[PDB]
Amino acid sequence: SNASDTRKAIDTISNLLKIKPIYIESMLQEMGPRQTQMFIRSTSNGSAEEVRKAAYLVFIYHTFIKNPSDENVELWRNTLIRAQISPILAAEHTDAALFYFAELDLDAFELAQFRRHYNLHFNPEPGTLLH
């Protein structure tokens, strides 16, 4: 069911974030074959909650992995917010990144510092301020 599940995963995530499919396909290209198959299967067969987890992988890919500039991070953070997804980035999101993009040989320390600086810089400290 590889072909059908691949299109469903791409459509479901792109529809959730309201972005063009190319942004999902580009991320898949940089996952290894087994990692892609696992990601596709969990996203096409998962609840709405499993699709929301995939939104954070999209964010990590387009920011930390491809372009971590403040301007680009603000762009992708607002995409989460516009999808009613919390912009808070949690440890389970970056740990999931470390598997799915394992072939990229990501720096686990730098990824952890990216998450820490991202939450500090962009998510304002009084938690009841959701902007």
Tokens of 97: 């990144």
Query: Cα 64–51–77 angle (5° rounding)?
Result: 35
DSSP string, 48-98: HHHHHHHHHHHHHIIIIIT---HHHHHHHHHHHHHTT------HHHHHHHH
Quick one: how many helices (H) and strands (E) in the chain?
7, 0
Measured between alpha carbons, how far is 92 from 122 in angstroms, rounded to an integer? 19
From the number of C-beta atoms within 10 Å of its C-beta (0-12, 13-18, 19+), residue 33 rates as exposed
Measured between alpha carbons, how far is 39 from 69 in angstroms, rounded to an integer? 27
Q: Which of 11, 35, 15 minimizes the C-alpha distance to 25? A: 11
Cβ atoms of 104 and 60 within 8 Å: the answer is: no
**How far, in whole angstroms, is CA 78 from its chain's centroid?**
13
**How far, in whole angstroms, is CA 119 from its chain's centroid?**
15
User: Strand, coil or helix: what is 117?
Assistant: helix
Measured between alpha carbons, how far is 47 from 35 in angstroms, rounded to an integer? 19
Q: What is the resolution of this structure in A?
A: 2.0
In the chain, after which residues does the backbone break, taking C–N over 2.5 angstroms as a break? Answer: none
Cβ atoms of 72 and 63 within 8 Å: the answer is: yes
Cβ atoms of 110 and 65 within 8 Å: the answer is: no
